[PDB]
Design a protein around this nucleic acid. Structure first.
Ligand code: MN
Ligand code: MN
Ligand code: MN
Ligand code: MN
Lengths: 745, 745
DNA sequence: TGAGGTAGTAGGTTGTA
DNA sequence: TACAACCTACTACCTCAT
DNA sequence: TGAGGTAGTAGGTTGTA
DNA sequence: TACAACCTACTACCTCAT
């Protein structure tokens, strides 16, 4: 089979126990808590003594050479205590930080073209390289004509074991930056009203957008009684305004919104935010060109990290610590156990389907009882386009036809829909006010001959005249009518395509229509392990200080949705309260007992993120009820990438490819081709349970492949994935009694 | 008529412009913001210089005598600038703080019984008196045998006009305190496991409850490596542990829960929280005895504040400023305009009702269409008690009978209910687990012959075996069946009463049953002013970091509920977002157009609290739609009390009694007899609108008197009152389409 | 919002304590 | 205050080919 | 949770900036 | 950090008397 490896390079030779200088931080201020100042004391002693290595154990600072005890800090009186050779066996993380410091100090001395520094070193795990290794294996500055920089952004994490052997865990991202601030764009004369920007002279994390450009110069005394240059000199920041010339004083004052009031900054201090949108708006050719540079398959990630490690080389102050430029041939050397999980068997109306598109030839597994009467909203200037769109949808669903012809790929009577262009209604709506959208949706429910809406909304782009998706879905949630919304662009694809491109649009639209009416296209034939129901718990954070409700979804062992429970009250944080856990799991056991006749003997709880809930509550709750339960932490955001090494040839791994060490597991659930990036695996760890992680990973990978809303699988299992979809459609939850209908899909 | 006055005493003579010493606070720390340290600098310069008057203007400190510039503070370098006689016309608040300082300094020198200080002065607006003026006009220490103190808690607010004349606005509350800490209760030997306590050695505001009492002494070195006395000496707080004796070192360590982890305090530092519950549990006779001392009618409040002002007397450092000991005979001298608002005319089935209890003789105004089938849950050991309870409810509602006899006060066929003890179901439920409560409610909806539930729940007290209200109301909200819950004690009142006491129980239960099925008992005959709909906006805060959704209720001009809108997403703060305002008021105009055929020409928005929303949004939204709108800020919590002075005789004001100065208005909406306290008026101000405040106050007082869930009126208007009731029943909102049924009631 | 993925940009929450 | 793991939101790009 | 009020205890959020 | 107006939660007490 294909071996699996991670982005890791083995260190040649070990590190020795070396002399450290233990320092003490005490709470010199009005407080006495040193834990709230330990990292600040580390950073100030590192920065105030020409960037020399300072490390952190629980209350102490450790240093590789003799530095004077600093009383100059007002918050931290760092003082020498003793001189101790720390052993490797008790100080793994400290020697990991030592190795990453010496990697940083070795890479600071590396140059490109003999003049330019290659790496931007701040002596951290994060390393920005000013140049990029290209696909043709050449270090090149990726700049544009408009000053946009692309920088390869490395993240090192060396791990030292008890013997001193070092394993350099690596990853690489991209970094969008620019050297042109707003002063240079005003010297050039660019439209800067409304740009999302950041201030390089403050560390405050907040959305900064430009209101306008005032004609007042920065040297003129402002509305606060003093000028802005005087305002920067009074803030003990006169060194930033010291190098300003007379032409710099002729800069126009650019006021900037800081989400509470109008801030007043100078245009030299503010730098624009280089998103994909800004980069595409200003220089679209450069944003085309870096598409193969930011979306890196595992071979080009290996070549990038190989060039990085060749730039590291030998480290003469760690007993000649050099790193290999090859990945491990297997992760068994790293403790992981690798493999591939077998594909789920998906059942249809005619039996096993080999692909998800064969469900439109075989027919869906469960059609809901009853006839589905359509209704259609569409904007008024898009009439015949919407005619052709609903014509294509109905010919796909009922009459089994694509482009008017009966197709071998499509079965007749996929969904028992009822749409007659004489009988069914086409209510057109004028684009415009939001209350007119809401009244148009209420007007379409004025006629009781509509059981499902195929409303055509404008594009999610085109920031002009308001989108009707949000008012339509809110009103149809208030009215408990399901609805599949469609952009104007998708309707124009249905009107204007002659190839089979719109067929896949039709596949996903009809799977949406089916899931929203309680139908099921495919089911699992058999789930691995002894499980009765799946619960996917999640708490999402919409904004600052706003949390989504602790959404749960309930599945059976075959992965069809029994239930979802949105608690009506929000909570304080990402931990679910035991009262909310009471609500959720009483709803779980009630729904499983309603559809099955008894309590579930086995529950697997897929907690999205960390299972920070009280485990003693869970043990009491399911031990009083004779329920064996399992808590699996399914985690989305993880910088770890899995490769497939095959006689030294790095490639993207297939879906179902996992690595497993202990309870932590990284599993690839997406099959992503080269020149489209590399697959982001799911970090999966078991916080509680007694099922082995092979069963848990097989169940999670089975739950990824049974996403009933698309013909291609979800990256997340639909426990945590449908919890995310309900957190997205949280203002769109239908009013009436909770059932199998998947509104969020 | 009866004059209205406020708790205010006029000052005899004026204050002169006096010499101030303007000081400067600069941001000496790593920050430069002086507004975040101005009050701390005021307090430290006040405390570090033997409690001398320090005042705050926007960035400056003002002082009445020459104090040295203090550089000892690490955060504030307070420095003298200039010496200026501030004029009265520009510095109203500063001279108000001067007068309140000199009142504090005059009252510090006042003694009771020649030995004991009367007042506890911290030189603020708040003044605790150690003694109480009793009802018999005698200064007496209100102590108990268990160390519980009652203290009269004054709040002064002198107001100086431009001429220097001073008006002492006053109020008085009570203060529950004790002198016995947990060290003295352990020396006495009291049960202290589980007590809600506070630490007198920290200013952190949080719930502190005792987990247990450890046998470890406080002198023994703890689990942190150091003892607790060493922990207080290391925190620069060795003066608190300096006076401890050997018997103090034999105190047991009392660990205390601080909502995140176990804190470890000594029992001398922790003081128990003296609530009404703790006071009633320990010394119930003293809590009986102070009922007429904390709930003070306006005459006893006048006598208390009169004794307070007689203790103030003449102030020789404010040009002999003495205060009167009489209220104003009218608030026209204070700028207010007083009066009484006419009573609302309540219409019934037979016409105008003079009292709300005549609606049970005349019949209700609107019965809903259809027959209402009861269903009853009750706990199993309370069977015949629940038989008699539902017997009394059905004899009141349908057969018009009280205690089995046809009553002249009760009309036959009040509500078209259907309850046959042979046909209707009595599902009994075992008290116990919450999931058994939820399954009992689902079992009562297993039979489809129930349209309303009269479920009998256990008491809200009796912290033993779990209350079933919350699971029942959650499940019946999931099932869209309305339900009137009843305690076991109320059912025992229906079973065991022979007088007309349970008749009022029956009145409020049947008004609840009527409002929850969409019926309306009474309506307004005519509303004052040109208004089409009332909107009551509110955002509630359940806990720290948790906000209730921005609930709105919609009324017509006659005060019957058109609509309520709970947004599905929570928000960050008490300001309603303009997207949420879009949702709310589109729902408002849609509901008024659905029940009336057009948009409302006039809207009055009763915002509970502050109308902190964007007024430009409102003006744009209702100006594009040709709607004149009004925003009234109806405010619950206000220390201001209105009196009725009648030839110098102070008494409680009637309901509908208002005072009005400008846009701010205080209106008494509750008719509260003497020896039951004094009425808390509603602070009401118009943030936007063009209706006069007499119309706004008449509409608010009309909206108080049409609370359809009780035979006695609500203090709040049912705009803000029903917004509060939906915020309380926020996890109890029924699933199906929003209608006239008042679930929250 | 056809669906799903990769990618950056930005902002959080919590635990480490 | 501060990073490490986790999140969320938004936007490009890219593809979909029994 | 019959309903409503007054009362304390406690904890917030925001604006003042 | 800090008070001033506003809130919320909880608990006692008290009453209800056409
Ligand atoms: Mn989520
Ligand atoms: Mn969808
Ligand atoms: Mn409220
Ligand atoms: Mn009620």
């Amino acid at each position: 089979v294909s071996n699996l490896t991670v982005e890791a390079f083995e260190g040649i030779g070990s590190v020795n126990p070396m002399l450290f200088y233990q320092y003490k931080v005490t709470g010199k201020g009005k407080y006495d808590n040193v834990y709230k100042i330990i990292k600040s004391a580390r950073y100030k002693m590192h920065s105030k003594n020409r960037f020399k290595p300072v490390f952190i154990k629980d209350d102490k600072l450790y240093t590789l050479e003799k530095l004077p005890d600093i009383e100059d800090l007002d918050f931290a009186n760092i003082n020498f205590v003793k001189s101790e050779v720390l052993s490797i066996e008790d100080n793994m993380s400290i020697y990991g930080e030592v190795v990453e410091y010496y990697i940083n100090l070795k890479l600071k001395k590396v140059k490109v073209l003999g003049k330019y520094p290659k790496y931007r070193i701040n002596y951290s795990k994060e390393i920005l390289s000013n140049t990029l290794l290209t696909r043709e294996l050449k270090d090149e500055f990726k700049k544009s004509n408009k000053g946009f920089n692309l920088k390869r952004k490395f993240r090192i994490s060396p791990v030292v074991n008890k013997m001193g052997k070092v394993i350099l865990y690596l990853s690489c991202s991209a970094d969008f930056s620019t050297n042109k601030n707003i002063y240079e764009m005003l010297k050039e004369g660019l439209e800067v009203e409304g740009l999302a920007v950041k201030s390089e002279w403050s560390n405050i994390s907040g959305n900064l957008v430009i209101e306008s450009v005032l004609e007042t110069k920065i040297s003129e005394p402002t509305s606060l009684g003093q000028s802005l240059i005087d305002y920067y000199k009074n803030n003990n920041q006169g060194y930033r305004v010291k190098d300003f010339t007379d032409e710099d004083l002729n800069a126009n004052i650019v006021n900037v919104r800081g989400n509470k009031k109008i801030y007043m900054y100078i245009p030299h201090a503010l730098k624009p935010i280089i998103t994909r949108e800004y980069l595409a708006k200003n220089d679209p050719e450069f944003s085309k060109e870096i598409e193969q540079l930011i979306k890196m398959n595992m071979n080009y990630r290996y070549e990038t990290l190989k060039s990085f490690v060749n730039d590291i080389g030998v480290i003469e102050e760690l007993n000649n610590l050099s790193f290999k430029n090859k990945y491990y041939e297997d992760v068994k050397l790293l403790g992981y156990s690798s493999g591939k999980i077998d594909e789920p068997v998906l059942m249809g109306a005619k039996g096993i389907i080999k692909n998800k598109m064969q469900i439109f030839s075989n027919g869906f597994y469960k059609l809901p009882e009853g006839k589905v009467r359509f209704g259609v909203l569409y904007p008024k200037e898009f009439d015949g386009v919407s005619r052709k769109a609903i014509r294509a949808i109905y010919d796909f669903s009922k009459e089994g036809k694509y482009h008017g012809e009966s197709n071998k790929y499509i079965a007749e009577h996929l969904i028992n829909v009822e749409f007659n262009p004489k009988e069914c209604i086409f209510e057109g709506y004028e684009l415009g006010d939001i209350t007119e959208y809401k009244k148009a949706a209420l007007k379409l429910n004025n006629y009781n001959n509509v059981d499902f809406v195929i409303a055509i909304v404008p594009n999610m782009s085109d920031e002009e005249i308001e989108n009707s998706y949000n008012p339509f879905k809110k009103i149809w949630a208030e009215l408990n009518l399901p609805s599949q919304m469609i952009s104007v662009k998708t309707a124009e694809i249905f009107a204007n395509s002659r190839d089979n491109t719109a067929l896949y649009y039709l596949h996903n639209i009809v799977l949406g229509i089916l899931g929203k009416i309680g139908g099921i296209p495919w089911v699992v034939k058999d789930m691995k392990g002894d499980v009765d129901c799946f619960v996917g718990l999640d708490v999402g954070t919409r904004e600052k200080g706003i949390h989504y409700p602790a959404c749960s979804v309930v599945f059976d062992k075959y992965g069809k949705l029994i239930n979802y429970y949105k608690p009506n009250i929000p909570q304080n944080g990402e931990k679910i309260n035991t009262e909310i856990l009471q609500e959720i799991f009483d709803k779980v056991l009630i729904s499983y007992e309603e559809e099955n006749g008894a309590y579930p003997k086995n529950i697997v709880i897929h907690r999205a993120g960390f299972s920070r809930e009280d485990l003693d509550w869970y043990e009491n709750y399911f031990g009083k009820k004779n329920i064996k339960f399992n808590i699996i932490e399914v985690k989305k955001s993880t910088p770890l990438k899995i490769a497939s090494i095959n006689e030294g040839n790095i490639t993207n791994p297939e879906k179902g490819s996992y690595i497993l060490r202990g309870n932590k597991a990284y599993m690839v659930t997406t099959d992503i081709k080269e020149n489209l990036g590399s697959p982001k695996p799911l970090k999966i760890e078991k916080s509680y349970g007694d099922i082995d992680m092979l069963t848990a990973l097989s169940q999670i990978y089975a739950l990824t492949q049974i996403h009933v809303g698309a013909t291609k699988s979800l990256r997340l299992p639909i426990t945590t994935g449908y919890a995310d979809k309900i957190c997205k459609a949280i203002e769109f939850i239908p009013q009436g009694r909770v059932d199998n209908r998947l509104f969020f899909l």
